[PDB]
């Protein structure tokens, strides 16, 4: 049962993963009706993946597209033992397809950094904690991070990573794909979005056609 040391937003250690654009100014129309959410739908900066800015957004505080800057976490997730698979995470409460889960925390480092590491400090690690950032930079979530740090692999995922752009530095959020009910284990495909380690390990999401590997 593994320690880490909690945080509520990244740490960043030697680089900084700017994205390059500003999420800037939608044409979203706020609606008359004081809890009917804006910036939904059709969302300007949403269909790019860039959060509003809270000084440019239209739909003021009914703008529904800063989830991650204002730390939207579900409130409902519990850590778990997973059979054969240490420990897991799972929802309390059904969740909806799309919907925001949490953000991703660790400590931001560049590749050339999170190799040194996994050399001098997790080289004997049998679970790994670390996801792609984006331009050989990388979330180590092994020291610092947050409960999603606990989610596991599955070949037939039902929550994916998302890369945004929010007040222009990539963050990495993780949403449902599909509705879970009550008591679902999450899980993401990390194959995609986790960092390529060199060592493999055997799967046992128990999906009809799973690849049988992680990595
Ligand atoms: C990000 S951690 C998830 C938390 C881990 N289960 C624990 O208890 O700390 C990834 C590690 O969990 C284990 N794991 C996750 N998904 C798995 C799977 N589908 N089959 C076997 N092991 C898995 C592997 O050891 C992997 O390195
Ligand atoms: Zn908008
Ligand atoms: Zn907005
Ligand atoms: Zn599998």
């Given at each position: 049962?593994?320690?880490?040391?909690?945080?509520?937003?990244?740490?960043?250690?030697?680089?900084?993963?700017?994205?390059?654009?500003?999420?800037?100014?939608?044409?979203?129309?706020?609606?008359?009706?004081?809890?009917?959410?804006?910036?939904?739908?059709?969302?300007?900066?949403?269909?790019?993946?860039?959060?509003?800015?809270?000084?440019?957004?239209?739909?003021?505080?009914?703008?529904?597209?800063?989830?991650?800057?204002?730390?939207?976490?579900?409130?409902?997730?519990?850590?778990?033992?997973?059979?054969?698979?240490?420990?897991?995470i799972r929802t309390?409460?059904?969740?909806?397809?799309?919907?925001?889960?949490?953000?991703?925390?660790?400590?931001?480092?560049?590749?050339?950094?999170?190799?040194?590491?996994?050399?001098?400090?997790?080289?004997?690690?049998?679970?790994?904690?670390?996801?792609?950032?984006?331009?050989?930079?990388?979330?180590?979530?092994?020291?610092?991070?947050?409960?999603?740090?606990?989610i596991?692999?599955?070949?037939?995922?039902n929550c994916?990573?998302?890369?945004?752009?929010?007040?222009?530095?990539?963050?990495?959020?993780?949403?449902?794909?599909?509705?879970?009910?009550?008591?679902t284990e999450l899980t993401?495909?990390?194959?995609?979005?986790?960092?390529?380690?060199?060592?493999?390990?055997?799967?046992?999401?128990?999906?009809?056609?799973?690849?049988?590997?992680?990595?």
């Amino acid at each position: 049962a593994g320690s880490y040391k909690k945080i509520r937003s990244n740490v960043y250690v030697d680089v900084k993963p700017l994205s390059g654009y500003e999420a800037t100014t939608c044409n979203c129309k706020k609606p008359d009706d004081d809890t009917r959410k804006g910036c939904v739908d059709d969302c300007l900066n949403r269909m790019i993946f860039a959060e509003c800015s809270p000084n440019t957004c239209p739909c003021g505080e009914q703008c529904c597209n800063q989830r991650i800057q204002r730390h939207e976490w579900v409130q409902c997730l519990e850590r778990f033992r997973a059979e054969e698979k240490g420990w897991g995470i799972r929802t309390k409460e059904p969740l909806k397809a799309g919907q925001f889960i949490i953000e991703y925390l660790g400590e931001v480092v560049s590749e050339q950094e999170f190799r040194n590491r996994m050399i001098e400090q997790y080289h004997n690690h049998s679970d790994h904690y670390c996801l792609n950032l984006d331009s050989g930079m990388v979330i180590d979530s092994y020291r610092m991070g947050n409960e999603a740090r606990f989610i596991n692999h599955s070949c037939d995922p039902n929550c994916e990573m998302q890369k945004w752009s929010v007040n222009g530095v990539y963050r990495i959020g993780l949403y449902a794909l599909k509705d879970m009910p009550a008591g679902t284990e999450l899980t993401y495909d990390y194959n995609f979005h986790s960092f390529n380690v060199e060592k493999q390990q055997l799967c046992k999401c128990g999906f009809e056609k799973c690849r049988g590997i992680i990595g």
